[PDB]
Amino acid sequence: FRESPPFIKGTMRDYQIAGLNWLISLHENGISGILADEMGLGKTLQTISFLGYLRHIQGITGPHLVAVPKSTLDNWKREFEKWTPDVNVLVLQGAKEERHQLINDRLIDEDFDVCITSYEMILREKAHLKKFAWEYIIIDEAHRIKNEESSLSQVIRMFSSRNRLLITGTPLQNNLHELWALLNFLLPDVFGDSDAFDQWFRGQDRDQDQVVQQLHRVLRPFLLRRVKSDVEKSLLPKKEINVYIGMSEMQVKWYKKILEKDITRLLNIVMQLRKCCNHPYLFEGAEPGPPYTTDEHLIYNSGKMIVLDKLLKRLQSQGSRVLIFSQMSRLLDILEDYCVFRGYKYCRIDGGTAHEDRIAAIDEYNRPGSDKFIFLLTTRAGGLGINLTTADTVILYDSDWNPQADLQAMDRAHRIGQTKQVVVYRFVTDNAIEEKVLERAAQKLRLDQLVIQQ
Amino acid sequence: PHRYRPGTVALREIRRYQKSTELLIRKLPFQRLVREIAQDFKTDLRFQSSAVMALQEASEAYLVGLFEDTNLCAIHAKRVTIMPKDIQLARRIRGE
Amino acid sequence: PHRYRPGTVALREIRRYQKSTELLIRKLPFQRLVREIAQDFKTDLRFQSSAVMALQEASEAYLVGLFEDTNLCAIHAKRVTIMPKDIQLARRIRGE
Amino acid sequence: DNIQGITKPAIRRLARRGGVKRISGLIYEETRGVLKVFLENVIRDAVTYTEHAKRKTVTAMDVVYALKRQGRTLYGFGG
Amino acid sequence: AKRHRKVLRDNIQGITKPAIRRLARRGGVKRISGLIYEETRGVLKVFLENVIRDAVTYTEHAKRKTVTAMDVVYALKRQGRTLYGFGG
Amino acid sequence: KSRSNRAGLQFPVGRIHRLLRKGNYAERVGAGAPVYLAAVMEYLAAEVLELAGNAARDNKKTRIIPRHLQLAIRNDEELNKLLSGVTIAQGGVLPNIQAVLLPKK
Amino acid sequence: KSRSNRAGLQFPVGRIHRLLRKGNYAERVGAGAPVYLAAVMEYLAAEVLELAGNAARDNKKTRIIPRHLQLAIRNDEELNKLLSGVTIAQGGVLPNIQAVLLPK
Amino acid sequence: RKRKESYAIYIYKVLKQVHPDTGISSKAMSIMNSFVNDIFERIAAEASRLAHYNKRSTITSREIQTAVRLLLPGELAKHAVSEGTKAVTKYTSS
Amino acid sequence: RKESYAIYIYKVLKQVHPDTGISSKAMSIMNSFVNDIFERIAAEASRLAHYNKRSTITSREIQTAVRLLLPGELAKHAVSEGTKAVTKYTSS
DNA sequence: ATCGGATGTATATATCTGACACGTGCCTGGAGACTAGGGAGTAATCCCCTTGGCGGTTAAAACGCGGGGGACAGCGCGTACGTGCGTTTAAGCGGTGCTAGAGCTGTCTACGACCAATTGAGCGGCCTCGGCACCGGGATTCTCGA
DNA sequence: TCGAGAATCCCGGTGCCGAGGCCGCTCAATTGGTCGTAGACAGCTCTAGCACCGCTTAAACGCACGTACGCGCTGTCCCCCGCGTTTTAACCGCCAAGGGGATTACTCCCTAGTCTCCAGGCACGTGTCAGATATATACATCCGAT
Residues forming beta bridges with residue A161, ordered by sequence position: A134
Query: Would you say the C-beta of E5 is within 7 Å of strand J?
Result: no
Asked if A143 contacts A168 with a C-beta cutoff of 8 angstroms, the reply is yes
What residues of F are in contact with residue I57 (Cβ under 8 Å)? none
Strand partners, I21: G63
Tell me the one-letter amino acid at A337.
D
Instruction: Say which DSSP state D26 is in.
Output: T
CA distance A18 to A4: 11
Cβ of residue G31 closer than 8 Å to a chain D Cβ: no
Beta strands, E only, A292-444: 322-324, 346-348, 374-376, 393-395, 423-425
Neighbours of chain E (3+ CB pairs under 8 A): A, B, F, H, I
Q: Is A264 on the interface with B (CB under 8 A)?
A: yes
Shortest CA to C1' contact from H5: nucleotide: J123
Give the distance between the most distant pair of CA atoms in chain G.
68
For I:11-30, CB contacts with G below 8 A are 11-13, 15-17, 19-23, 25-26, 29-30
Residue A72 and residue A95 in contact, taking contact as beta carbons nearer than 8 Å: no
Q: Residue E3 domain-assigned?
A: no
Q: Hey, how many other C-beta atoms are within 10 angstroms of the C-beta on B37?
A: 17
Q: How far apart (Å, rounded) are the C-alpha atoms in residues H81 and I73? A: 47
Instruction: Using an 8 Å CB-CB cutoff, list chain F residues near B75.
Output: 98, 100
B81 secondary structure, DSSP code: E
- Name beta bridge partners: A166: A34, A139
Q: Which residues of A337-356 are buried (b: 16+ CB within 10 A; e: fewer)?
A: bbbebeeeebbbbbeebeee
The answer to whether H15 and H22 are in contact (CB under 8 A) is yes
- What region, left, alpha or beta, does residue E13 occupy, with left being phi > 0 and alpha being psi -120 to 50 degrees? alpha
Burial (CB < 10 A; 0-12, 13-18, 19+), residue C92, is middle
Angle (deg, nearest 10), helices H10-18 and H26-54: 110
How many whole angstroms separate alpha carbon F79 and alpha carbon F73?
6
User: Determination technique for this PDB entry?
Assistant: cryo-EM
Count of domains for chain E: 1
Report yes or no: G56 and G62 within 8 Å, Cβ to Cβ: yes
Task: Judge whether F43 is closer than 8 Å to chain H, CB to CB.
Answer: yes
Look at residues F58, B56, E77, F46 and name the one whose alpha carbon lies nearest to residue H32.
F46
What is the domain extent for residue I87? 1-92
Which amino acid is it at G99? A
Crossing angle, helix F14-22 and helix H26-54, to 10 degrees? 50
The residue of F69, F87, F100, F104 whose CB has the most chain B CBs within 10 angstroms, and thus the best one to mutate to test that interface, is: F87
What type of residue sits at position A243? V
User: Which residues is I33 bridged to in the sheet?
Assistant: none
Residue C30 to chain B, least CA–CA distance (Å): 28
CA F68 to CA F91: how far, in whole Å?
A: 8
Contacts (Cβ under 8 Å, ≥6 apart) of D69 = D45, H70
Topology at the third CATH level for domain G1-103: Histone, subunit A (1.10.20)
Q: Cα A229 vs. chain centroid, distance in angstroms?
A: 20
Residues on chain H touching F40 (C-beta within 8 angstroms): 39, 43, 64, 68, 72, 80, 83-84
Quick check: B76 and C92 in contact, CB under 8 A?
A: no
Closest CA to G56 of G70, G35, G76: G70
Chain A residue nearest residue B38, CA to CA: A264
| F29 backbone dihedrals φ, ψ, rounded to 5° | -110, 130
Q: Check the CA dihedral A57-A59-A61-A63 and report its sign.
A: negative
Query: Chain F partners of B18 at a C-beta cutoff of 8 Å?
Result: 92-96
Query: Are β-strands A161-168 and A34-36 bridged in parallel, bridged antiparallel, or unpaired?
Result: parallel
Question: In angstroms, rounded to a whole number, what is the distance separating the alpha carbons of residues B23 and B83?
Answer: 25
Q: What is the CA radius of gyration of chain A?
A: 25
CB atoms within 10 A of CB C13: 15
Cβ–Cβ contact C68 with G under 8 A: yes
Q: How far apart are CA H18 and CA H21, in angstroms?
A: 9
What residue has its CA nearest to the C1' of J81?
A: D24
Closest CA to C66 of B72, G70, B62, D11: D11
Task: Name every chain E residue with its beta carbon within 8 A of the beta carbon of H35.
Answer: 84
Is I50 in the F-facing interface, judged by CB distances under 8 Å?
yes
Q: Residue type at I43?
A: A
Give the Cα separation of A84 and G29 in Å (integer): 87
CATH number at residue H92: 1.10.20.10
| CATH number for the domain whose boundaries are A258-453 | 3.40.50.300
∠H84-H88-H92 over CA atoms, to 5°?
Answer: 175
C partners (3+ CB pairs within 8 A) are: B, D, G
Residues 6+ apart with CB under 8 A from A438: A399, A400, A428
- Angle at which helix H77-84 crosses helix F33-43, to 10 degrees, equals 130
Three-state DSSP class for residue B9: coil
Measured between CA atoms, how close is A269 to chain B, in angstroms? 16
- Number of Cβ within 10 Å of residue E82's Cβ equals 19
Other beta carbons within 10 Å of I33:
24
CATH number at residue D60: 1.10.20.10
Cα–Cα distances in angstroms (integers) from residue E50 to residues B41, B96, E72, I72, in the given order: 11, 13, 11, 11
Chains in contact with chain B (at least 3 beta-carbon pairs closer than 8 A): A, C, E, F
Any atom of strand K under 7 A from CB of A151? Answer: yes
Domain range for E50 is: 9-87
Resolution (A): 4.1
Instruction: Find the CB nearest C93 among B78, B85, B94.
Output: B94
User: Domain boundaries in chain A?
Assistant: 14-230, 258-453
Q: What distance in Å separates the CA atoms of residue H70 and residue D45, rounded to the nearest whole number?
A: 7
Cβ distance of E30 and F92 shorter than 8 Å: no
Q: Which residues contact H37 (CB under 8 A, 6 or more apart)?
A: E88
**Strand ranges, E, within A263-332:** 322-324
Residue-wise DSSP of I66-86: HHTTS-SSSHHHHHHHHHHHH
Tell me the shortest Cα–Cα distance from C37 to chain G, in angstroms. 23
Nearest chain E residue to A280, by CA: E3
State the Cα–Cα distance between residues F40 and F62, nearest whole angstrom: 27
Q: How many CA atoms lie within 13 A of I9 on its CB side?
A: 25
Instruction: Please state whether beta strands A161-168 and A322-324 pair in parallel, antiparallel, or not at all (unpaired).
Output: unpaired
The amino acid that residue D54 corresponds to is K
Q: What span, in angstroms and rounded, lies between the C-alpha atoms of F75 and A87?
A: 65
What's the rounded Cα separation, in Å, for the pair B16 and A317? 69
Chain G environment of I33 (Cβ under 8 Å): 45, 48
Does residue E65 lie within any of the structural domains? yes
Supply the CATH classification number for the domain B1-96.
1.10.20.10
Q: Answer for the pair B54, E65: CB distance below 8 angstroms, yes or no.
A: no
1-20 in D: which are within 8 Å (CB) of G? 17, 19-20
Phi first, then psi, for residue E22 (nearest 5°) are -70, -15
Nearest CA in chain C to D38: C59
Give the chain D residue nearest H54 (alpha carbons). Answer: D53
CA–CA distance, A148 with A181 (Å, rounded to integer): 7
DSSP-derived pairing of the beta strands I21-22 and G63-64: parallel
The answer to whether the CB atoms of E62 and I48 lie below 8 A apart is no
CB D41 within 8 A of CB D63: no
Of A71, A82, A92, A91, nearest to A49 by C-alpha is: A82
Minimal C-alpha gap between B57 and chain F (Å): 6
Contact B56, B25 (CB under 8 A): yes
The two beta strands, C46-47 and B81-82, are unpaired
Q: Closest nucleotide to residue A352 (Cα to C1')?
A: J54
F51 CB and strand J closer than 7 A: no
F92 burial (CB, 10 Å; 0-12 / 13-18 / 19+) is buried
Return the sign of the alpha-carbon dihedral for residues D70, D74, D75, D79: negative
Name chain B contacts of F66, Cβ cutoff 8 Å. 21
| Residue in G89, G32, G29, G92 with CA at minimum distance from that of residue G59 | G92
Q: Which of F92, F97, F101 sits opposite B80 (nearest CB)?
A: F101
Please enumerate, as own/partner, the contacts of E4-13 that have beta carbons within 8 Å and a separation of 24 or more.
Answer: E4/A284, E4/A292, E4/A333, E5/A330, E11/B29, E11/B32, E11/B33, E11/B36, E12/B33, E12/E41, E12/E45, E13/E41
* 8 Å CB contact of G10 and I12: yes
Spanning CA of E65 to C1' of J47, the rounded length in angstroms is 16
Count of domains forming chain I: 1
Quick one: which H or E segment has residue H40? helix H26-54
- Pick among H71, H75, H83 to test the F interface (most F CBs inside 10 A): H83
Rounded distance, CA F46 to CA B29, Å? 40
Per-residue H/E/C for F3-29: CCCCCCCCCCCHHHHHHHHHCCCCCCE
Which stretches within A365-448 are classed as H helix? 405-408, 434-443
Closest nucleotide (C1' vs CA) to D4 is: K60
Q: Which of B55, F89, F66 is nearest to E69 (CA)?
A: B55
- How far CA A167 is from CA of A4, A70, A453, in Å, comes to 21, 16, 21
On whether the CB atoms of residues D30 and C87 are closer than 8 A, the answer is yes
Report the alpha-carbon distance of residue A308 to residue C58 in Å, rounded: 80
Neighbouring CB atoms inside 10 A of A133's CB total: 10
Q: What angle do CA C18, C23, C25 make, to 5 degrees?
A: 105
Would you say G69 and I29 are in contact if contact means Cβ atoms under 8 Å apart? yes
Residues (344-363, chain A) with CB within 7 Å of strand J atoms? 350-352, 355
Closest residue of F to G25, CA-based?
F24
b/e sequence A410-430, b meaning 16+ C-beta within 10 Å: bbbbbbeebebebbbbbbbbe
Measure the CA–CA gap between E82 and E75, rounded to whole angstroms: 9
CB A332 within 8 A of CB A326: yes
Distance CA(H4)–CA(G95), nearest Å, equals 56
Contacts of E18 (CB under 8 A, 6+ apart): none
Touch test D–A: 3 Cβ pairs or more under 8 Å:
no
**F25-37 burial, b for 16+ CB within 10 Å, e for fewer?**
bbeebbeebbbbb
F33: left (phi over 0), alpha (psi -120 to 50) or beta: alpha
Chain C window 31-90, residues with Cβ within 7 A of nucleic strand J: 44, 46, 81
Q: Which residues contact C27 (CB under 8 A, 6 or more apart)?
A: C53, C56
- Residue C42 phi/psi, 5-degree rounding, is -155, 125
Q: Which residue of B has its CA nearest to E29?
A: B71
Q: Which CATH architecture has domain A14-230?
A: 3-Layer(aba) Sandwich (3.40)
> What's the order of all strands across the beta sheet hosting A374-376?
A346-348, A374-376, A322-324, A393-395, A423-425
DSSP assignments along A106-172, one per residue:
STTTT--SEEEE-HHHHHTSTTTTTTS-EEEEEEESTTGGG-TTSSSHHHHTTS-EEEEEEEES---
Determine how β-strand A374-376 pairs with β-strand A346-348: parallel
C-beta of residue A397 within 8 angstroms of C-beta of residue A427 = yes
Backbone angles phi, psi at C69, to 5 degrees: -115, -10
3-state class of I22 per DSSP? strand
